Amino acid sequence: QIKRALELGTVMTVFSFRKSTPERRTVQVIMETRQVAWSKTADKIEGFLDIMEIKEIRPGKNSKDFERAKAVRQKEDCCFTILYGTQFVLSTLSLAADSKEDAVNWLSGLKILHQEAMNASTPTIIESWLRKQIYSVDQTRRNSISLRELKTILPLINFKVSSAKFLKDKFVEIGAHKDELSFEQFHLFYKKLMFEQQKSILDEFGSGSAVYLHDFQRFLIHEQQEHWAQDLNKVRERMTKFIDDTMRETAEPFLFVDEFLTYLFSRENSIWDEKYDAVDMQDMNNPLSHYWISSSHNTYLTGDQLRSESSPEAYIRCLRMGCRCIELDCWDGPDGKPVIYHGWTRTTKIKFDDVVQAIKDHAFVTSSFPVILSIEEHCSVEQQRHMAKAFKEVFGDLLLTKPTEASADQLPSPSQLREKIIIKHKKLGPHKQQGELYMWDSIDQKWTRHYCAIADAKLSFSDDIEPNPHESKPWYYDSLSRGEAEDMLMRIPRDGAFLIRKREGSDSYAITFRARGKVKHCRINRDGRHFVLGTSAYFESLVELVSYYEKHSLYRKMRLRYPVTPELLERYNMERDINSLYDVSRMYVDPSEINPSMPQRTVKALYDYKAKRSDELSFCRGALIHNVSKEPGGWWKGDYGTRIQQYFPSNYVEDISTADFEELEKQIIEDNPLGSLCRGILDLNTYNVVKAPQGKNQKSFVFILEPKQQGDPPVEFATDRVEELFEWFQSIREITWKQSIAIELSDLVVYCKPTSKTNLENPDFREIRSFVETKADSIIRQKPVDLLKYNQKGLTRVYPKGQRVDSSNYDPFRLWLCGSQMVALNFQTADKYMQMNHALFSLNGRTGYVLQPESMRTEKYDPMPPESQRKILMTLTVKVLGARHLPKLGRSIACPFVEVEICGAEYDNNKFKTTVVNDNGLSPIWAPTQEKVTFEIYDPNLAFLRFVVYEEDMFSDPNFLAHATYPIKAVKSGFRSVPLKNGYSEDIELASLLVFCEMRP
Ligand SMILES: [Ca+2]
């Protein structure tokens, strides 16, 4: 059809906000990889996007590329935008065609090409994936593969080649006529690799020669509990649709046992129950107060709360996920039209008019159910009039302007309010000093950018905002012992301080670095010419290794920054003498003093214990040990005093009581404006501020906090402009020396009238109460039953505390179980709680409304029963058997393990982890190591089954790879695939666990 017109290609004009001049390119669809490619010449493809990653094809000149370009002369009807990607912020390919003909050809042709890809079988996606891989080396659109190029690819696809024999022994077995492998020679290699690596799973299945039509139907009926599989003709179809072999399609289909394993790891065999993919309108006729409503906080932001980009695309992205409650922070614009950003911060400003349009175009595309606009009002009465007018005019009939029923005593249903936009805004009755400053490092002799803020006469500042050639380099030490290195690096008080030394009595090396006032050592061996850090981190050169870990994290979030040289030790030693009269530590804060006390992860010592090893902690009876990570057997890991996560006997501690609570409440860290991002705090009452007449260290604009108190260190800050320095100077000097609503908008508030009324008695259904995270958590703590009863008729919004400046999220489980409707979360953040939110709102067809269960509305509903009165409705047993295509995080091959947990407000860290597989992300296996674990579930409708895949790095630290999180409601039994998602809950190509699950009611 037009698919051939797209496969051939089309010359069009590409626009990037990243490139300043539009570039003419041939745009084509490679059917073999299912990519949209754009090339300058025929030989090489400049750039590509996977069709699988397309979220929207938007006609016109509505993209960041278009609006940032100089002109765009091409017509609206020749212009369109492919919005694609794996993150919250989607990439944009903005295109202008020569003609309206071609443009319309693409929008139609791409839509059907996407659907084909979505609906395609796993074996079709594998061939596309194998096609992508051989293209990737030299980008020629290759036909065959070298032996040396396959050995270069295997580590990139997260597999370590055990030996050279393994490939050649394979090569022969597949048929290695030469070192070259054709595409189908490579295709056959993958299948053999996957089967041989994972064969052992079969010991759980039949002793037949292959899996025949009848064997498979039994498997679907009895072990998978699929009762459609009675209809034997449906079972033969599934087989054939999977296989796709014309010669075997004849008569009765059978899978080869390796094709059966592939099916078990495949989408087709997902743990997810599909009936929950559609809306159920029988669950959409309850009052609005009975629904969990997918809710965003400060929707405009794409990043942190301090300096990240505001975009209308954030509203679009959230709305098209089915988010139904979005936030507009409305501030006085320059031209009497409101702007939206985070007040007083360096977050970019966007126009209210662009957000209103964006909401109108996107509110009701993927979900028909009512959208709630939470308006935080800082605008003038006149600017409020523009908002009242703009809403009415742009939204028209979509804008709820009067109640659904006049004589109502409860809220209307989501059904009744379809394609309605509801204004939450204060209804009429009938200036923090902050920004970016440069700070000076005497060690590095460099300035870095920090976000700083003054709260209650205290300036808080953030962390910074971003042939053996090593023999000449002064960070390399030819003849240095392990003990000296530790002492040398213990002299330099900086995380990321490093040197590389040759190991004593060996032609091999080590990197030793300081992290959190403690030195660590990393072994660097040689593989012929190459250098290997730990196990599989390959480098050509120790300079290349140092370059990489300057840009990429080596240990946790520590990078290499401070090369420990003789010149640095010489300089710092003298400077430490000169600066002896003050203690520099006092301006920085301790990394534990910003880390909160864990809700329930604290133990109390039953006995005195003396450490038999440096590994082990030593403590007295009565000692409270915090942030305990519980593993099986004798030894647990936890923090006591200064030390962190050291080993101790588990049978030497007991649970804390309420009597210990008061002691932990005193130990609760004092919040600062930068929360987790805070690096140091300065008491401006104990300083004078002076401007350096001629700046300092090559900055012109430098102010200095000079200490009043003995021992307190002076602090130097710099600005880009003298005007910044003045505002900071006068803000600091003023410490060191020492409600109108526009009727027009007010009238648009039908429901969701904000109220205060002190406390939760007499809920009005037209009213909404909002609680910051902190207030919400104290209500849950003291008044949970009041919140529940209020939430039956009234609505509740919760939003993150102001300190979550990193755009981190908070536990919504307890709030949800008290019937709280709008638990507003940072959708731009890839963390556990957004993952929970996406899981919950995957139910009921991604409408962003989930009916609270009937159980929550009976008199005998208790979220928190006593231990002895715990009623068990279901047991869930889980075995993690294996995984395919785990992502490669960094430079080394994944050493994966899986953590399984039942998530909810009834569950105190109810998890188990698998053992670690060494250097294999492509095809790990865990089946032989552990038995099933059994979970007791109190209510299946109130809980989530969460799988998280971690890599175990060289330091034994867990790093996130993927997750899958499901309401237990939608979990199927038997040998099930678990399709793995990234931190943003976007699908990772061909990535899946294989698990066994048993649910007994
Ligand atoms: Ca806000």
Side-chain angles (χ1 to χ4, degrees):
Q1 196 194 136
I2 290 173
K3 302 210 316 191
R4 292 188 288 92
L6 297 187
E7 190 180 324
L8 263 63
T10 294
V11 185
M12 298 197 258
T13 322
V14 177
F15 298 80
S16 289
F17 70 86
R18 292 201 261 274
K19 294 188 166 183
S20 50
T21 45
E23 63 197 353
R24 273 232 168 202
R25 299 280 178 269
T26 303
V27 190
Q28 68 200 130
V29 174
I30 297 86
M31 306 293 289
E32 301 172 329
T33 55
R34 290 175 172 160
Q35 301 172 292
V36 173
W38 56 95
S39 62
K40 184 194 163 179
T41 80
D43 293 318
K44 295 199 160 184
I45 295 166
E46 166 170 291
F48 67 86
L49 65 86
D50 294 359
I51 296 164
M52 290 301 281
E53 296 188 356
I54 299 170
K55 295 291 186 284
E56 186 189 358
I57 312 168
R58 184 187 300 162
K61 302 173 182 184
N62 308 275
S63 86
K64 193 162 90 155
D65 302 315
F66 279 132
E67 288 171 338
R68 286 267 288 265
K70 296 168 187 160
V72 196
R73 269 147 205 102
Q74 292 94 339
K75 295 132 281 188
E76 281 275 16
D77 45 54
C78 301
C79 294
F80 68 95
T81 311
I82 308 182
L83 300 110
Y84 71 99
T86 288
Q87 310 273 292
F88 177 71
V89 180
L90 298 175
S91 292
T92 37
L93 183 70
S94 308
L95 302 177
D98 307 312
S99 55
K100 174 177 191 276
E101 295 158 46
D102 290 319
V104 171
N105 284 345
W106 275 90
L107 296 175
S108 77
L110 276 172
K111 184 170 173 190
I112 68 95
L113 273 165
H114 179 229
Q115 285 229 296
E116 280 171 23
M118 292 282 98
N119 306 329
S121 66
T122 292
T124 312
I125 297 176
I126 289 169
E127 204 160 324
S128 299
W129 178 86
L130 285 166
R131 188 77 70 181
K132 285 156 144 97
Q133 294 315 302
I134 72 163
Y135 280 32
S136 80
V137 59
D138 90 1
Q139 194 195 86
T140 305
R141 192 210 276 260
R142 297 259 282 184
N143 184 40
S144 88
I145 294 91
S146 182
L147 194 161
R148 326 304 156 169
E149 283 148 19
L150 181 58
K151 188 135 200 164
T152 295
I153 260 175
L154 275 179
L156 295 188
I157 70 165
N158 226 357
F159 191 70
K160 177 175 166 193
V161 203
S162 43
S163 42
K165 56 173 173 181
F166 168 88
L167 282 190
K168 270 168 172 170
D169 271 34
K170 272 286 147 58
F171 260 81
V172 162
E173 166 162 306
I174 309 113
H177 14 253
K178 287 145 202 175
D179 290 334
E180 298 282 59
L181 292 173
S182 184
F183 178 58
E184 274 300 310
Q185 309 273 316
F186 176 54
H187 198 327
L188 182 56
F189 173 79
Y190 170 91
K191 288 186 154 213
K192 281 204 153 147
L193 175 49
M194 296 310 316
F195 185 68
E196 295 314 317
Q197 207 75 228
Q198 301 196 313
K199 182 177 178 297
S200 39
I201 276 157
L202 298 174
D203 202 53
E204 283 286 357
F205 299 97
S207 47
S209 34
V211 50
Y212 285 94
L213 193 269
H214 57 274
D215 292 298
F216 188 62
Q217 182 224 31
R218 198 252 302 289
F219 162 75
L220 284 172
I221 287 175
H222 290 270
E223 290 178 324
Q224 304 299 84
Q225 276 176 33
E226 302 275 6
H227 301 321
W228 63 254
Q230 227 69 56
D231 188 332
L232 190 71
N233 104 83
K234 288 194 178 184
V235 167
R236 76 160 71 231
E237 180 185 3
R238 261 286 188 75
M239 281 215 182
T240 53
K241 202 196 299 187
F242 192 78
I243 292 171
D244 205 36
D245 189 28
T246 275
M247 290 297 290
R248 203 218 269 87
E249 205 158 18
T250 297
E252 302 302 334
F254 78 110
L255 291 157
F256 287 119
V257 176
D258 67 81
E259 300 175 296
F260 180 64
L261 261 177
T262 313
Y263 176 85
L264 288 184
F265 282 89
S266 73
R267 269 275 177 193
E268 290 85 354
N269 192 52
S270 173
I271 199 164
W272 178 254
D273 190 349
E274 289 148 308
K275 73 174 167 209
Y276 295 102
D277 277 326
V279 201
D280 194 344
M281 299 305 289
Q282 294 317 119
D283 294 332
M284 292 308 225
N285 310 313
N286 271 243
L288 215 70
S289 47
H290 291 176
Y291 292 84
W292 299 312
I293 313 178
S294 188
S295 297
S296 168
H297 169 256
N298 284 356
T299 317
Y300 49 95
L301 293 182
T302 60
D304 71 40
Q305 300 275 313
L306 300 181
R307 48 176 267 98
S308 77
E309 270 205 349
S310 306
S311 181
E313 296 295 355
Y315 287 100
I316 293 172
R317 190 84 167 86
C318 290
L319 283 173
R320 290 177 81 87
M321 288 165 171
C323 181
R324 295 297 96 184
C325 198
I326 54 165
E327 183 165 357
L328 290 75
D329 295 347
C330 289
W331 297 83
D332 288 322
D335 56 1
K337 291 167 182 183
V339 285
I340 291 169
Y341 86 125
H342 192 197
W344 308 113
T345 75
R346 300 303 308 287
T347 59
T348 76
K349 309 189 167 63
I350 58 176
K351 299 170 155 190
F352 169 88
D353 282 345
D354 294 325
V355 169
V356 169
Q357 248 310 119
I359 289 162
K360 190 227 185 147
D361 292 319
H362 296 283
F364 308 117
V365 172
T366 72
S367 171
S368 301
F369 294 85
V371 170
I372 301 182
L373 310 185
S374 190
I375 316 291
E376 194 189 311
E377 192 51 280
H378 303 275
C379 285
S380 84
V381 171
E382 195 68 16
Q383 297 220 34
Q384 281 186 43
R385 284 205 189 79
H386 176 85
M387 296 178 359
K389 177 174 184 182
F391 287 145
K392 287 184 225 186
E393 209 153 314
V394 178
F395 290 156
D397 280 353
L398 302 183
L399 185 58
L400 183 80
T401 52
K402 64 181 182 174
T404 308
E405 20 179 32
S407 72
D409 29 32
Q410 58 181 214
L411 278 159
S413 70
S415 271
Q416 283 167 331
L417 282 156
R418 267 173 297 169
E419 293 184 338
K420 305 302 299 186
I421 298 172
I422 305 171
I423 306 296
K424 173 177 163 287
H425 189 287
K426 292 180 176 189
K427 191 181 182 68
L428 291 160
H431 302 275
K432 228 176 183 73
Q433 177 67 39
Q434 57 179 288
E436 283 157 48
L437 295 171
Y438 301 103
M439 297 189 65
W440 179 248
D441 208 317
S442 54
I443 318 292
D444 225 16
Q445 295 200 335
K446 278 159 190 165
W447 295 95
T448 47
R449 268 209 206 270
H450 310 261
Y451 203 90
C452 305
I454 293 175
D456 294 295
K458 297 179 187 167
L459 191 154
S460 312
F461 63 90
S462 72
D463 269 56
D464 64 299
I465 308 155
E466 274 66 36
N468 291 300
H470 66 287
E471 282 175 350
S472 63
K473 293 301 193 287
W475 42 257
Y476 177 61
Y477 293 87
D478 217 321
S479 151
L480 183 63
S481 90
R482 186 204 221 254
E484 291 159 278
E486 285 188 352
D487 297 345
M488 285 170 58
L489 270 145
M490 280 290 98
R491 251 177 274 151
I492 291 165
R494 292 292 190 279
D495 292 6
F498 77 97
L499 58 89
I500 290 181
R501 62 177 158 74
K502 180 166 177 146
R503 308 216 296 270
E504 285 174 298
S506 186
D507 291 40
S508 59
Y509 306 91
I511 176 93
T512 110
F513 59 90
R514 190 208 270 234
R516 176 142 195 187
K518 299 203 175 190
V519 173
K520 315 196 76 58
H521 306 275
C522 263
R523 138 173 151 278
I524 303 171
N525 294 345
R526 289 167 128 160
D527 204 38
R529 75 174 172 285
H530 293 311
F531 302 84
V532 174
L533 174 61
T535 293
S536 51
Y538 278 78
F539 295 98
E540 288 204 19
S541 133
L542 294 98
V543 172
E544 184 180 272
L545 182 149
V546 158
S547 285
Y548 181 87
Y549 291 108
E550 272 176 50
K551 310 149 175 56
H552 304 83
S553 81
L554 168 64
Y555 175 73
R556 310 205 165 164
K557 285 163 166 195
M558 189 218 72
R559 285 165 210 191
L560 308 183
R561 181 178 155 182
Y562 309 95
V564 173
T565 64
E567 173 166 9
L568 176 67
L569 282 174
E570 185 83 330
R571 202 211 313 122
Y572 185 66
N573 191 246
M574 295 207 211
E575 286 181 340
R576 192 181 176 75
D577 281 345
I578 293 169
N579 297 334
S580 170
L581 278 180
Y582 58 76
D583 172 37
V584 174
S585 284
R586 294 189 191 180
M587 56 159 162
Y588 308 122
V589 83
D590 208 279
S592 35
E593 288 174 6
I594 60 167
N595 185 33
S597 175
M598 277 300 285
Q600 289 154 289
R601 291 194 180 192
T602 324
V603 294
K604 183 169 69 179
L606 273 168
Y607 316 99
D608 289 331
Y609 184 68
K610 269 194 167 186
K612 298 177 178 184
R613 305 183 164 87
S614 59
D615 183 71
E616 296 171 15
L617 245 170
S618 205
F619 56 90
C620 297
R621 195 172 67 187
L624 297 187
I625 303 157
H626 323 268
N627 300 295
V628 169
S629 306
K630 296 186 186 188
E631 314 290 2
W635 273 271
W636 291 344
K637 127 183 171 174
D639 316 333
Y640 181 50
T642 192
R643 280 160 81 173
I644 297 296
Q645 299 278 35
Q646 294 289 115
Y647 291 32
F648 60 86
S650 63
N651 76 321
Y652 269 60
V653 296
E654 68 178 348
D655 282 341
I656 65 167
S657 67
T658 55
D660 295 308
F661 279 16
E662 216 157 43
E663 183 64 18
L664 295 190
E665 285 182 44
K666 291 193 190 78
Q667 277 208 60
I668 298 181
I669 59 173
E670 192 168 24
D671 263 322
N672 83 101
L674 309 180
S676 311
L677 295 192
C678 186
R679 189 197 175 136
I681 313 176
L682 304 178
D683 194 348
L684 291 177
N685 278 304
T686 73
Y687 285 93
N688 294 303
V689 65
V690 178
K691 185 190 186 268
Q694 302 203 148
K696 216 195 163 216
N697 294 127
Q698 307 186 259
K699 291 292 191 185
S700 291
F701 320 115
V702 178
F703 72 85
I704 309 189
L705 296 174
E706 287 183 334
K708 288 193 215 178
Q709 303 185 347
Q710 68 170 21
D712 285 350
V715 190
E716 305 158 17
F717 293 101
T719 67
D720 282 318
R721 293 183 67 166
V722 71
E723 296 90 341
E724 293 167 325
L725 181 140
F726 288 156
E727 286 175 1
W728 276 99
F729 192 92
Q730 202 228 44
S731 287
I732 292 176
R733 199 175 167 275
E734 270 163 17
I735 286 160
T736 61
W737 256 111
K738 288 195 162 191
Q739 278 294 147
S740 292
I741 312 160
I743 312 179
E744 297 83 346
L745 186 67
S746 177
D747 288 345
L748 296 185
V749 177
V750 175
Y751 312 134
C752 291
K753 174 193 181 169
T755 193
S756 54
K757 300 273 201 188
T758 322
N759 290 349
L760 277 175
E761 280 184 304
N762 289 326
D764 192 313
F765 77 89
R766 297 161 294 197
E767 290 193 331
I768 192 169
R769 283 159 137 116
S770 299
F771 311 109
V772 71
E773 164 183 358
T774 287
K775 178 74 182 287
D777 286 346
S778 52
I779 292 178
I780 294 288
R781 221 222 231 180
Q782 295 162 184
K783 278 202 225 143
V785 174
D786 289 12
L787 189 51
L788 182 72
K789 286 185 152 189
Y790 170 90
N791 278 328
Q792 285 170 358
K793 262 170 197 162
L795 288 175
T796 302
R797 191 160 178 281
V798 179
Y799 54 88
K801 65 187 189 196
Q803 292 85 0
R804 296 195 183 282
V805 125
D806 57 353
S807 292
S808 62
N809 287 318
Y810 57 100
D811 189 28
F813 300 140
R814 287 189 166 105
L815 284 164
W816 280 334
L817 290 192
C818 293
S820 295
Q821 296 93 347
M822 288 157 277
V823 182
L825 294 171
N826 297 306
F827 271 56
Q828 70 271 37
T829 295
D831 72 347
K832 200 210 178 172
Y833 295 132
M834 261 322 291
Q835 295 160 22
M836 305 317 306
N837 193 75
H838 291 324
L840 170 57
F841 290 110
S842 290
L843 295 172
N844 205 35
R846 293 162 151 75
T847 55
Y849 291 84
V850 176
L851 179 53
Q852 296 167 10
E854 259 178 308
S855 48
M856 293 182 60
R857 259 166 263 121
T858 67
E859 288 291 335
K860 290 170 192 177
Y861 173 63
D862 191 356
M864 279 290 225
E867 191 233 342
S868 36
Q869 307 308 302
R870 286 186 207 288
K871 206 219 302 177
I872 303 178
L873 291 181
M874 173 176 154
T875 59
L876 206 172
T877 93
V878 181
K879 279 185 214 169
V880 173
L881 295 168
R884 295 188 171 194
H885 294 264
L886 296 182
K888 197 181 172 184
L889 181 142
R891 182 55 79 103
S892 77
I893 308 294
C895 302
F897 71 95
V898 184
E899 199 178 26
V900 182
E901 73 175 302
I902 304 298
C903 290
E906 293 185 293
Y907 305 100
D908 173 40
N909 301 243
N910 199 12
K911 36 186 128 211
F912 91 83
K913 80 170 213 138
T914 71
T915 58
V916 183
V917 179
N918 294 310
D919 311 315
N920 185 356
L922 184 52
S923 61
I925 279 231
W926 297 279
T929 166
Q930 299 148 109
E931 293 96 40
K932 59 162 74 178
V933 155
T934 309
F935 293 111
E936 294 159 58
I937 278 77
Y938 314 112
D939 201 339
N941 285 358
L942 302 181
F944 307 82
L945 174 60
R946 184 168 168 79
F947 302 88
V948 184
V949 187
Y950 297 99
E951 82 180 359
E952 181 108 311
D953 76 6
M954 54 200 299
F955 308 99
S956 297
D957 285 326
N959 296 328
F960 175 102
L961 284 183
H963 87 102
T965 312
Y966 308 114
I968 275 152
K969 185 171 279 195
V971 167
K972 292 146 87 195
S973 55
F975 294 88
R976 292 294 178 172
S977 79
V978 178
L980 286 166
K981 300 177 158 147
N982 66 7
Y984 289 100
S985 302
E986 293 293 346
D987 298 347
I988 300 163
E989 187 160 59
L990 292 174
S992 92
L993 306 185
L994 169 56
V995 308
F996 175 85
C997 280
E998 180 79 30
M999 300 82 76
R1000 293 307 201 86

